[model samples]
Target chain A: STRVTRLDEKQSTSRERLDDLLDTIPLATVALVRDGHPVAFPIGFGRVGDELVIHGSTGSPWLRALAEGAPAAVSVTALDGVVVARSSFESSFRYRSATLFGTFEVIADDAKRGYLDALTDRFIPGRTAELRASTRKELAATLALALAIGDDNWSLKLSEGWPDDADEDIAAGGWAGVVPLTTQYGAPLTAPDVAAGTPLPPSVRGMTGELRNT
Target chain B: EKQSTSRERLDDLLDTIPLATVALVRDGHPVAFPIGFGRVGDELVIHGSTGSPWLRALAEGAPAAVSVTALDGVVVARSSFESSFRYRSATLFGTFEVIADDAKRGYLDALTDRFIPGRTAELRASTRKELAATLALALAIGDDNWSLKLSEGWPDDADEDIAAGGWAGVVPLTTQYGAPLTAPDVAAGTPLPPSVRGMTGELRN
Candidate 1:
């Protein structure tokens, strides 16, 4: 029978590494259950203390269920590209991802407001102080769910670089190579409402360009 | 035919791999797209917005194909005919249905924060408008069938290539971490978050 094992200290170390890698990337596709089947969505996220926070509409059924204390699971991934080789059997892909299983709790209204500010700031740091606060209607409508990080609850997996080849295939010909792919933020497009000469905030300027591991 | 192992099932593959390439079939043809997934008991929870027709179709019981792969390295050989890649990949055949309204929020939150910790504190809460605009689905990994194929070691023609004075070897592929980039607007000297500051070079256990 297949059984789940406790990731030892060594394995646990990898979880932390995976978390770090996940942080470097800007977008993550989150998976959950709605009705009876699988539903997945790409979302922007950031760490909040020990829990992961994702924002959405307060009126959303998903948010409502979570606020009432339902368990939810999530996954985040980054794809490098496809690794094509001489043999179809040898073909594969290079990628990185983390899967987490946990329950989500909705932050109360009082706390919700602060989180929204923090999230926006993290996405575009320092912008929070400059931008107008969320309107009452906006605050009432937005929802944020927090999931705690725990053991045996999360896993990080990765596949990268070259391909495997047999001697004959190598000499036979065909370029055995890797096509690199990445997710990068384009130049910051200032909010149209902003005054014509507002200097590019450090946060917006910093976010421009391709994402690289720090 | 070789007997299938429990580990080879789609559910097991989903359990083992962190990311999956979810293929959508429109007009009888498959368009494969990559997505992250989480397994909760027998249900595969996937979250997205209602504005997404592809996700909506899958949640409403449309059939979908999912694929996951782990590439170890490249096997270079003397003869181009024998070149191959060492890897482990699994393809699953199944359909996903939407989770009920009662359970949507919890799952949505779990899905959101799992990827970005501490984010719950930073963003606006979801409003009625947003909820009505979003969608989430759950697929059963239990009944799905999947196959795993793994290739390891150098090509079988290494010896022949050596004799032919051709280079035959393996080129290792790996992912490494680089220095973190702090947000430009971060208070000039604000310290890095513990999570960011604690990062190290290890890839996996």
Candidate 2:
């Protein structure tokens, strides 16, 4: 039977296993309750400090509802590969994931600005300062919310590493193993207005190589 | 054998695949497109043009389909005739409309930042004209209508073929994050953003 394990309180291998899984999944789905039902959308997320920050416009109904104390859940998943077992009944997917459930708090405007800067820099590094900052209207319009990580607040689950098959299936005399899958950034397309002779910065230049850490 | 009902398996599957292929139907055919989405309450939010005819249609109460898929592996049988790919796919069927003007701005900004993190900060703010030009849409994925299908394990083949020596295994597939590319015209001497420099594959608390 599948069990719900408190990911933070225990020191079991499962906890570590879950942590490793969470580290690999970059995208997450943030779900909220709407009109007596649950609605979820995928969002790109990264860990900052001890909290999960989701940025958006301050005036959004979703953000407003979340800031007003609505419950929210964020889910992240890593798709390792497809698992092929000897038996049709035992086939499964190899993956790891983390889900967080809690109330979202609206960061104060000043902090929201700072976090937005961090959030932008998180994606493009160094571009935040180079680009124009948000204007007063823009600042007032944007919103960033954070959900703290804690007990009864988050869940992490994993099913990966290798195939788990019965002895009979293992001895069935069929080849079985993992197929390597990867997602990498494509070539950068410079903006049309970019002036000629502008050299690519380290950040842009560094992006050319293979992604060292999976 | 203990048989898990389709609904139970589906619920479990839905919890895993967050991204979906969202389709918009124009003139009866489906204009299906993949989107990275999140659930806010019971409503589904996706990034797109605010002034889009698609958004207009959705706002007018058109139904939309959101499909999520997980490709497990390629199933290669001893005989080429039985080869197939193992996968799990789910579709959330429902009607989604646009948010009100007062709420539109925030939702659009969130969609942008969610994908690009601090994009709203480093780039020019969306002008009033731009805001009027762009459109974002929202849909609800509820119990009213949702479907799921999954195929796993090896395909049926003759025992003799299984015993025969040949290439028969699963090829893995993955989505990896490549390094961030900076604009070519970025001024020299500027340092990388704190968020970018500090990014690691750790879950947000």
Candidate 3:
């Protein structure tokens, strides 16, 4: 069964929270086992309908294992803040994280391009509109895999609250609140290779947003 | 085997990254989390309350896998398939143990100073009660450490892709930190610490 058993039951979250979490976080750490040694790598991911899609170089043998249906774990997390309590032990962080464990099924060729566009749009909003149509050769060079979140192998957690300051800590007298961390995009730079004076595309401009800060 | 970084060299790489995603096995399934982490020599240090089941699980000798990454930019290749992220990611495998000494105090201080500059000196010193509830675990990377694919720059798309290019270049991405907020309950006159003031420098160390 999918259950979160970490710090507090109060931190257990809803599917809507999971969806929102996936939408905000841009990258995920995908976990796999190779001959019993654990490997976790950061990969860009996009949520498409009920499935989470990830793509890799077609020639990567590591991905070959994933495409072949090896068990996998994908985790997306946003570190919210450094919770400063009265005591060192009581100090912690404000974080929202989601983890899913399941096998990845290779997206069929028929639906691959559409899904790739969806993935592309997720990263750079409206980006699919500007790109040239995907050719068959391009599709062959990329491998896309999908994992359904509806399966019973997922956990979503939210930890956004004040520190549990003990009476003694309250009496100790120190700042007792969160140093909220925020992620923002810097100014955009046009590629040097692009045609001169090409207007900065909206999709490229729209890609910048304030990732959650609470 | 891939080229491994020397022990001293590895620490430099680990120290620069802002976050770490750690994976551990639970009920035969690998579970991962992006956690607040710091480095202690060759050991990876993570601090939390004693109530953390995740750290406890690792302290019981469960194998631990930790990954750190930085996003340089997005490489838009001529081929849709070749589009990728330019990044550096490193993963280390090891085990952790609960720290039972005053060393945790120092690491806690290091953490405070790192995240909130000049605030650590202003905060109250550690007490016995605080130490009891805190759990500090360090996972030594050992020989199981390795850096995975370090994509340095622009994608090398094929000839046709270059010719078919609608837009072929990198849409650089960088994570910029923002201004900090003083704890709502602090004294009215309490100033935002130097870390939060400009938020321009050393907020990420």
* Full-model lDDT for every candidate: 0.53, 0.51, 0.72
Per residue, candidate 2 scores C-alpha lDDT tens digits across A1-214 of: 1233222222223545544544444345666655544444444444554567766556667678788986766666555444333332233344555656678788897787677666544433454544445556656766778888654555555554454555664554443333333444345433223345444544444333322112
List candidate 1 stretches off by more than 4 Å: A1-13, A191-193, A212-214, B1-205
| Interface RMSD of structure candidate 3 (Å) | 2.6
In terms of docking quality, how is candidate 2 classified? incorrect
Residue-wise lDDT of candidate 3 within A1-214, one digit each (tens)?
3565556474555788888888887788998876666678788889987889988779988688899876889988887776766555566677788888889999999988999999987777676787777888778888999999884678877888777777776765655667666565555555566667666666666656564211
Kindly provide the TM-score of model 3 when superposed on the true structure, using C-alpha atoms: 0.88
TM-score leader:
3
TM-score of chain A of each: 0.81, 0.80, 0.93
Segments in model 2 whose C-alpha atoms lie over 4 Å from true places: A1-26, A208-214, B1-205
Model 2 quality (TM-score): 0.49
Error of 1 at A206 (Å): 1.0
Clashing pairs in 3: none
Candidate 3 per-residue lDDT, tens place, B18-103, comes to 57888877766677777777776666788766776877787678787889887666676655666777676787877787776868
From the highest lDDT down, the ranking of the candidates is: 3, 1, 2
> Across residues B1-205, which tens digit of lDDT does each residue of candidate 2 receive?
1222366666555444445655444443333333455454456686545444545677777666566666544443333334344566666767777677678667766654443344445433444654565555677656657766566655565555445433343333334432433323334454555434332332111
DockQ comparisons of all candidates to the true complex? 0.02, 0.03, 0.49
i-RMS for every candidate: 24.5, 24.3, 2.6
